[PDB]
Amino acid sequence: SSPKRPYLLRAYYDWLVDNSFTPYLVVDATYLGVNVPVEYVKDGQIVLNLSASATGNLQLTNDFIQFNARFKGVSRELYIPMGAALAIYARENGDGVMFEPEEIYD
Template sequence: MTPNRPYLLRAFYEWIVDNNCTPYLVVDATMPGVKVPLQHVKDGQIVLNISPGAIGNLLLGNDAVTFNARFSGNPFALYIPQRSVLAIYARENGAGTMFTPEEEWQEDELDDADTDVEEAAVSDSPEPGPDDDKPKKGSHLRVVK
């Protein structure tokens, strides 16, 4: 069966908002694929206010939670894979739920890890290039799929 987390997340979100409370999402920011502002991550986790008035373009999909938000006045597009969602709760009273790891996603992560290792082995090989005395100033960031 498919993981039930996306369905439970949508239900808890709707329930919290219908009761005029503020939904907070707890995310494991160390998981692969998570795109959140790193300066707000504490102990590997980030707590996000996902109330309708605080964010835009919220999509609680089966694979990921996506939305736009502002942090310190700067716009940011967030991408949160469902497997990285740890909990959803109401700020006012703490009502909500914590999620346990699901077997379906753990198997997917093992498959992804095997693929990442193969890709890393290919991409880590040195590329032939001209010998310049100037050091290259490439980006320290790389795209992780």
């Protein structure tokens, strides 16, 4: 069967937004195929605010997360392979999920 990660990602994203929390996505910036501003990468990772307010055209698909965001006013198109998505949680209280290390992503 396919990985459960993308389904759980969508579930927690909606739960976070519906509860007025700001969804923060933790990404492994070293993962193959990741496209993010390297200047904002720290400790091999990057945290991204996925709220509709901080993004544009957000897509949460099975194999990837894609959206536009701004950095110091500059707009860029981010692309995150699902295997690089490590967790999603509330900026406000830390509630969310740290994804299980599903084999298929290794």
